[PDB]
Amino acid sequence: SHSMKYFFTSVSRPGRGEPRFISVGYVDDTQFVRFDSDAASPRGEPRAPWVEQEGPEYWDRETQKYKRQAQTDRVSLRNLRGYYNQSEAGSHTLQWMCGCDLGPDGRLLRGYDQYAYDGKDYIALNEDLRSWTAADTAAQITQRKWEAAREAEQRRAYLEGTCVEWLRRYLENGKETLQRAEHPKTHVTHHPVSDHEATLRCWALGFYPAEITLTWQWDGEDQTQDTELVETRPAGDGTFQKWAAVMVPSGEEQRYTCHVQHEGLPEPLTLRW
Amino acid sequence: EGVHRKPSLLAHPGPLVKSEETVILQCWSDVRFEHFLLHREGKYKDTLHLIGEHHDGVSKANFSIGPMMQDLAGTYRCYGSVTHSPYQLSAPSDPLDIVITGLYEKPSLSAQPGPTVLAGESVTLSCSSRSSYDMYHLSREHERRFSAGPKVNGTFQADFPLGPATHGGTYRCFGSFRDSPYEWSNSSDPLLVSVT
């Protein structure tokens, strides 16, 4: 399912000036835009080739939207201090996540529009794109203001229209990378743990859609237990890494197999040491 | 009274400022102040400075509060400076509340015993919405406020008795939430009261 997701973070820093505001946008697992209030002469910046040619009007109004949202967050943080009866001495964090899921038939599958304050759910637009869920009585004030402002109707038109239409455009202009899965390069390494045992580590490197499954099998049977697995991690170039390891009695190495499942492989891969 | 007496402060075209529009806050005095300071107190305190302008009769400074945003709403006082470097300020002007409007849906505004009334008859104006505004504001063509009447048939409403009808006027109504008293809804549909 393709998706476009935006993430906004504002952190107040009492005494150290105005809040730090940071926003990033993704199509699937590809960052494509960034805005940081601490950069010199901050503006929206491209981070993927397929928005670099959107033109100066596109980039100017995104930049102005970011700058207005940074100041809107400053009022929001001040309101939140009031709602929770907090002093002006503490640092506080407002996070906003907003985005789109398409699915195979490529119109809106699911919208997202939701907030956290100091790491806790605050308010969320419901799956119906017309009503809100407030997490506590402070967020009930925000809910009451947003019902009076008819905010849900603006979020909804963004999620069903703008968000879907521009995601489709980004998928087309960037189809050469967003829609061409980059397959993992795989190998198994072998690290003796003793004389009676060794660690088999199955490696997947440089794969782009971050979703992947590595399963060690013994005579075809899934080795659920006894398999250490790391969190998928960014390689730093847009691709991802992951390994899965298993402790085997030395001598029986070759009845172990690694099963790799990934969108960039026509068939899943079976490999051995 | 001395040169430290307070100047005056007004909003052009008025103190109720629609979102993203501009207002001019003018300070003026017959005192030939060389500078003026405009101070907004409260949650977003700020201070602006303008050299004084001297025309016949009045010494003024015209502060433009532009792209109306919520951080610009609040109470404004202003000061004249008898001096140039370190400021030697006059008494503060009377405070002036500058509100941003247009942030929420308009309330309804109606005349209880009819809007066209005979002279002498008492008349009640009522501000009602189904948004849960805390406070309602009634303005004849600017600031009169009453608290909301909590969930009755689900509407929140506040009633303004106008007393026995002398002159009449055109009335508008705005709703507001307790924690941000300078941030108002859209104007209700204006109601013309005729006292015949």
Binding site: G25, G44, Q69, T72, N79, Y122, E151, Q154 | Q70
Partner: peptide
């Protein structure tokens, strides 16, 4: 495209 500018909380 950014989700525009939302109302304050």
């Amino acid at each position: 495209l950014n989700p525009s500018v939302a109302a304050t909380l």
